[PDB]
């Protein structure tokens, strides 16, 4: 079940993956990057991407939280672990749709980021 | 990326040498981590479970703190005593000649 996913600030348009421990939706809000071992133990309103290294919590749990502290959606760059994947096929009905992406896309996504231009996200079915 | 062991370009800092404390820079969008000498003014250092990190110094009147109950500089015109500061300087002992230090 894939998804696509468009920015802009205040253009890019990309492809993606949604993941079947969430549930499926689309969702908006701004864009903000957060670390891995930032999800453990800023404004709502907002569709977070963090890339996951090749631990503290659970992919899931890790999902989980990031809903919890008031995420529309997760974005979650696998580059760098495919297996990630994998691991998230189990279902567990997450509210916040969970979204993966991965290469040049990805790329671009995080350029975006880096370039500290505010911008806005959302995401569709 | 300075100080960290494991390192990435995106997430900054992964995993930090024993000697330096963890640290998570906001930067608007943008969230990299850091492995610090000592915490950075307004945070005191924490050994947590899996790493040294930085905890919010969050005392009455205090900007800098060593630990969670104890402060090493005050806000500037308050005056300190075992570790906490104060404005009305209490009856213990009275504030010295010209330092503010009950």
Not at chain 1, 111 to 119: I, R, S, T
Not at chain 2, 16 to 32: T, V
Request: glycine residues 8%; positive net charge.
């Amino acid at each position: 079940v894939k998804a696509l996913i468009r920015v802009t600030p205040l253009n890019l348009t990309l492809e993606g993956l949604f993941a079947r421990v969430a549930e499926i939706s689309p969702a908006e809000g701004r864009l903000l990057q957060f670390h891995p071992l930032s999800l453990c133990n800023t404004k709502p309103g907002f569709i977070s991407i963090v890339k996951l290294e090749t631990p503290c919590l659970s992919l899931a749990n890790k999902a989980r939280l990031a809903g919890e502290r008031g995420a529309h959606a997760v974005l979650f760059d696998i580059t760098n672990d495919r297996g990630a994947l994998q691991q998230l096929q189990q279902p567990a009905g997450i509210n916040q749709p969970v979204v993966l992406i991965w290469g040049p896309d990805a790329e671009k996504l995080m350029d975006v980021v880096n370039k500290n231009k505010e911008a806005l996200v959302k995401i569709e079915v | 990326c300075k100080g960290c062991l494991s390192c990435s370009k995106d997430n900054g800092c992964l995993r930090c040498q024993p000697k330096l404390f963890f640290y998570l820079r906001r930067e608007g969008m943008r969230q990299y981590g850091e492995c610090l000498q000592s915490c950075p003014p307004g945070y005191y250092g924490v050994r947590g479970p899996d790493m040294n990190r930085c905890s919010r110094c969050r005392i009455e009147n205090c900007d800098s703190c060593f630990s969670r109950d104890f402060c090493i500089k005050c806000k500037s015109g308050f005056y300190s005593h075992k570790g906490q500061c104060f404005e009305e300087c209490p009856e213990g002992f009275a504030p010295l000649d010209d330092t503010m230090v009950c």
